Copies of this chain bind each other. A is one copy, B any other.
Amino acid sequence: AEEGVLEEAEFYNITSLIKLVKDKIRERDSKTSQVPVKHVYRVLQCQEEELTQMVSTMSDGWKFEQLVSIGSSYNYGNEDQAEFLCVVSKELHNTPYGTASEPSEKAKILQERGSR
């Protein structure tokens, strides 16, 4: 367990060693994002013409997970702007807490502004 190595680093409280084992645990969590740790998700919106393009030009690391059609008021199907949602994912590293996910005041101000 890299967690055990991190605990041993804590016992000798070597900060560089702490950082290194936490980097190892982050690499683990990115590689083990399906073990419940950080895992990022998004949805793109495209129609078929751009759909092929950005499926083909999908980023290295982001994995396609699902496509879906959305009801098209034009004709019955294709060639409507609302054509396909594209839910994609990426196995993202989980950073051990105490060093990450630390908010800021103006960031929260803007978050409240954009929430509505």
Contacts and interface: CB of A to CB of B under 8 A. Distances in A.
A71 B69 contact: yes
Contact of A78 (B43, B51, B71): B71
A28 B67 CA distance: 30
Interface in A16-45: 24, 27, 30-31, 34-39, 41-43, 45
A85 interface: yes
Contact of A91 (B37, B48, B84): B37
Interface of A: 3, 24, 27, 30-31, 34-39, 41-43, 45, 48, 51-52, 55-56, 58, 60-61, 63-73, 75-78, 80, 82, 84-85, 87, 89-91, 94
